[PDB]
Design a protein around this ligand. Structure first.
Ligand SMILES: N[C@@H](Cn1oc(=O)[nH]c1=O)C(=O)O
Ligand SMILES: N[C@@H](Cn1oc(=O)[nH]c1=O)C(=O)O
Lengths: 258, 258
């Protein structure tokens, strides 16, 4: 009856507030998805609890063990009732869980340290000086693993065998790795996160190239859950009334220090 | 058992082929949505018939008579089995019909005749020399009718009372009206159509401003239809394998004459 919301610490969606040590409950948190849970709760008439996904992951199926990890796994195993996160709508996920219509559009993009002589994914695939990677257990890695597109296939072959490992555990770690690597690491991440960090101190990074694809974040519920109907309605209503646009501006543009 | 596909003549989605008088059946047609029906049919294993919506409309509910017109109405009244069109996912529509996840992202935009001193919706709302409108029975008009945003409210108040009428029956008529009006008409339409016409002869038009909103086209089926599952799966698969990106490039960029 209290709705269990699974979410992920990813700026600016869900962030620890400044006085979070002294705070209790959903009040420890802020960000885009924090706000959005509140709007979705008000419109659906539920009470809820924000919970940070136990393994820190978005969601992959172990092609060995066939087990879902991340927020996807929590929905699959009935550990959460809904996921309110930058969670990418994909086919393999759509086969196991329900998604709202998207609340945000995005595609994979390239983050470089300012001055990095890379304009494109093709640039990246044509060279070996600049290492490049993606996050584990998330849609971006899967994108490169399944790509039949020549350039993205080549990037995948490189990435899966690169030493030391190119993949990172969290986006924050990818982002630090571009920042510390002096131009010798480029990070493959969604446009939305890329654009956010581009407007944050120390202002040393930038999105280059076009988006590599076009996709969306949805609210996810366990397959067949009775919440799914009202939450999808809520999302479309929130979009239509201009509330998702206001919240994007709150969290990205009014948050900008560059 | 033969799937009845409702669609709309809208370039470049569904267009009469050149030798169409001599052609039979689905072979009279080409475009993005023509192709996409074929991909969705192959993946779902159905045979189908393309049919152009009888009233020429996208879909509105008469707030008088409470009756759905357009492709929405054909799905509602069981006159078609699926709609494969630039059909905008909206809440009022989602309450009556089923939508796939989006196959294309877009927002409302402004089309001007080259040299028109308009940069924005705010520009438009601040003046009366340049008339401006939208299509009947479609999501753009509804957008302006329901807007509480100051600038869009003002545009609506203007538009609903403007004489002669600002609204057009078909996008083609909006587009001609910008072309013939010498800069004195600006047309409110989706970005996707706007960007298409911007790359077509006589190259006299342009998209100005940012998008006014962020939405998607979905494949629609009658509420509860048994096709809806497989078609949504097909869309996500088509997106993921890069086929929607190829088809957008086929129909917009390789079609460009400017
Ligand atoms: N939203 C992604 C997580 N992820 O965020 C990125 O910037 N890359 C990436 O894979 C997902 O749902 O898997
Ligand atoms: N996709 C729209 C039709 N329409 O196309 C535009 O460019 N304006 C507009 O209302 C709809 O589904 O209602």
């Amino acid at each position: 009856k209290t709705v269990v919301v699974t979410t992920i610490l990813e700026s600016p969606y869900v962030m620890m507030k400044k006085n979070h040590e002294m705070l209790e409950g959903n009040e420890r948190y802020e960000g885009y998805c924090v706000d959005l849970a509140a709007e979705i709760a008000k419109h659906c008439g539920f009470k809820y609890k924000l919970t940070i996904v136990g393994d820190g992951k978005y969601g992959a199926r172990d092609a060995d063990t066939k087990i879902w990890n991340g927020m996807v796994g929590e929905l699959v195993y009935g550990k959460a009732d809904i996921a309110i996160a930058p969670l990418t709508i994909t086919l393999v996920r759509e086969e196991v869980i329900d998604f709202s219509k998207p609340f945000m559009s995005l595609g994979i993009s390239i983050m470089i340290k300012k001055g990095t002589p890379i304009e494109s994914a093709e640039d990246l695939s044509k060279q070996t000086e600049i290492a490049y990677g993606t996050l584990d257990s998330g849609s971006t890695k899967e994108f490169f693993r399944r790509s039949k597109i020549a350039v993205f296939d080549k990037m995948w072959t490189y990435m899966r065998s690169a030493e030391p490992s190119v993949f990172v555990r969290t986006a924050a770690e990818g982002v630090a790795r571009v920042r510390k690597s002096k131009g010798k690491y480029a990070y493959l991440l969604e446009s939305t996160m890329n654009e956010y960090i581009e407007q944050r101190k120390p202002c040393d990074t930038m999105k280059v190239g076009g988006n590599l694809d076009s996709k969306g974040y949805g609210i996810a519920t366990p397959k067949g859950s009775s919440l799914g109907n009202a939450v999808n309605l809520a999302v479309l209503k929130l979009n239509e009334q201009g509330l998702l646009d206001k919240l994007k501006n709150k969290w990205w543009y009014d948050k900008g220090e560059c």
